[PDB]
Chain A
Amino acid sequence: MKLKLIVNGCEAPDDYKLLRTTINTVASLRKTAILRFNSERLTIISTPKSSLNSSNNGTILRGDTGQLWCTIPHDVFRLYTVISARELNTITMECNCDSLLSVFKRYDRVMNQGSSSNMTIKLQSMPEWNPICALGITFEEIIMHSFKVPVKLLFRAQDTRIQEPMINYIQLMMYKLPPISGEFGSAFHGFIRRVERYSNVNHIHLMGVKKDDVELKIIVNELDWHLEICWNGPLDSVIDISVMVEKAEQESSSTHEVIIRCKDWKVCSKLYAAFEEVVLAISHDESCVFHCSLDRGSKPRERGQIIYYIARSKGL
């Protein structure tokens, strides 16, 4: 199950930034993350349904339902040697975010020092200890620094159970957020972080109303006084015992609303500050999806994708 990979930060810094942001978000979202290595791309997944994550019982105690998916085209790695005997040569692993984040932080420190080396990653069988293997990582520091991280492989039955959430696209309203690098980036960044000024606020009500032809609002009713925050700047819109959640009747055909938690909003703000092209999709009283897209061309190349699904924190 060879997984020899080469990572360089001096070539195509956008890809390195995307990988760093993905690992940072998955580490800040949950303790362990799933890594799928396909013949075409690398998928990094943070889901409460993972074997290691489900132990914490986050869903029933704190409502940890959000799911984070990141796709990294194989062009990011200088060398992509992924050979397997499964569908499309897919190898699934469940790694710990803390060790990987620490290793990448050390790599960032070394790169900022001035080194221009490369990081080599491989899958090895540690004799010290779903068999558990090690992710051997090596790199030079102008001195061969080598670190190893425990990892657990997943079977096909285990791999297929982890599926990306699918949203009702026809019943979904998408808004194209202003670019962060643009003149309106700072204003929107402040607007997203505005609700953080209220310590005791735990839920925020996002609303989007047609009539630049749409407007977005954040409502807070957890204080002694009703609070409404409106963005008046330009904003373009893209054109068992289980039961179905009850959806409140829409006030109008051109208004989409959803109540979510403040932590998810902070994560969305971090994602917006990380990437340039950001899209906010709202399914009325159902969910909120943050889609960050990185575009690179040569024969256009694969589009780097980061999708964060957030379930409603409360009903409407």
Chain B
Amino acid sequence: LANKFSASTVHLEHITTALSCLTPFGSKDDVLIFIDADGLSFVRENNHVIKIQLLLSRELFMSYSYRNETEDHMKLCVKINHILDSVSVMNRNSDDIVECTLSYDGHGSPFVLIFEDSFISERVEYSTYLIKDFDTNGLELDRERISFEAIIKGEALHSALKDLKEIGCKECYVYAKTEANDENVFALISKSQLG
């Protein structure tokens, strides 16, 4: 295509999954989109205290073209509520949608989302906004001063998070300890109405 960036895919689960993952960071706020040859990343930040970055790699898209030459990456900002509403209405007939393509043509142009069906295609253009002075790279892990690391299974962690949420947890404490004979102790301590 003539666009600077154009990525088309046939799986609609990735987009909806990413939007759902980004939802807990506020239904009405900004989302940063990073575009590079490696892929497309969605970034959100809350209260300068928490940050989330979800990456969709090149392999996930059946076609991926990044023809920009002057800059190695492209940065834009969109409103999450607009995308949420547009996808919710456009994804009502989720069974019939067959193709989904994102496109962008540099600064000053909208972010184009096209849902292509067998005979009907829906095209929506999202206006872009200036990126806030706050740098998302500021909140990063110092890879040379790791206090501790741990590997956990997704299901158990999800169950623990659900249990904490349902008891109205207010304060959380991650406790990590190691001993000899391969003894490990990783725990979450919650302060809530229960105590």
Contact residues of A with B, CB < 8 Å? 184, 187, 190-191, 194, 197-198, 224-233
Contact = CB atoms under 8 A, between A and B. Distances in A.
A230 B123 contact: yes
For chain B, the bracket of interface size reads 10 to 19
Given A225-B124, A230-B123, 18 more contacts: A187-B120, A190-B120, A191-B119, A194-B122, A197-B92, A224-B79, A224-B82, A225-B82, A225-B127, A228-B122, A229-B120, A229-B121, A229-B123, A230-B121, A230-B122, A231-B119, A232-B119, A232-B121
B120 A231 contact: yes
A53 B79 CA distance: 47
Given A198-B89, A226-B110, A233 B122 contact: no
A188 B123 CA distance: 17
Contact of B86 (A190, A225, A231): A225
Contacts of A231: 119-120
A233 B119 contact: yes
Given A225-B86, A225-B127, A187 B122 contact: no
Contacts of A194: 120, 122
A86 B122 CA distance: 55
Contacts of B89: 197-198
A226 B121 contact: no
Given A197-B89, A197-B92, A225-B86, A184 B124 contact: no
Closest 8 interchain pairs by CB?
A233-B119, A228-B123, A226-B125, A187-B119, A230-B121, A225-B124, A224-B82, A225-B82
Contact of A227 (B81, B119, B124, B127): B124
A190 B118 CA distance: 12
Interface string B100-127: 0000000000100000001111111111
